[PDB]
Design a protein around this ligand. Structure first.
Ligand SMILES: Nc1ncnc2c1ncn2[C@@H]1O[C@H](CSCC[C@H](N)C(=O)O)[C@@H](O)[C@H]1O
Ligand SMILES: [Mg+2]
Length: 160
């Protein structure tokens, strides 16, 4: 379709693990990755963090096939799934943890949806990009070799 430009660029695995640690993801959680790419975040959530449910939303068909293929080869089909669609339109209200690696302007556009649909205490973790106008509970630097990454953690209902 015709959604704001957000190309496929994945979060490095070390940053993926740190985003989930920072949000304190556990078995009780329901993790949504908005724009899931190859599915690495929801697969790590299910496989390493034992989450009861992980859902990736993805609009690109080639990416959906890779993600579904990755879910199968990791054996997590029970708990991890993909929703084909525009993340702007898909209901994310069941999420207890939402992960994002998008763009600051796309973060901006998502602000009404996040506030509308997410319950208080929902944690939202963003790789690299700020949610402008919100106050993060934490801002963390993650070193992956000689690369530095910033991770933002917000908590719905304590973000303003
Ligand atoms: N409006 C939209 N709805 C669903 N997916 C989208 C989207 N806009 C971009 N995407 C997808 O979101 C992905 C962003 S790349 C980030 C992938 C993953 N969250 C990670 O951190 O590794 C791309 O695969 C792109 O196809
Ligand atoms: Mg980065």
């Amino acid at each position: 379709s015709y959604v704001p430009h957000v190309p496929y660029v994945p979060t490095p695995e070390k940053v993926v693990r740190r985003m989930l640690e920072i949000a304190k993801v556990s078995q009780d959680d329901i993790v949504y990755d908005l724009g899931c790419g190859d599915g690495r975040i929801i697969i790590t959530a299910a496989k390493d963090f034992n989450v009861k449910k992980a859902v990736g939303v993805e609009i690109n068909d080639e990416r959906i096939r890779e993600a579904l293929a990755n879910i199968e080869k990791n054996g997590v089909t029970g708990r991890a799934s993909i929703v084909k669609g525009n993340f702007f339109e898909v209901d994310i209200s069941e999420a207890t943890v939402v992960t994002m690696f998008l763009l600051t302007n796309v973060n901006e556009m998502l602000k009404p949806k996040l506030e509308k649909e997410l319950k208080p205490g929902t944690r939202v973790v963003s790789h690299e990009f700020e949610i402008r106008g919100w106050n993060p509970k934490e801002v963390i630097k993650v070193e992956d070799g000689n690369m530095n990454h910033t991770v933002y953690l917000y908590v719905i209902g304590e973000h303003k």
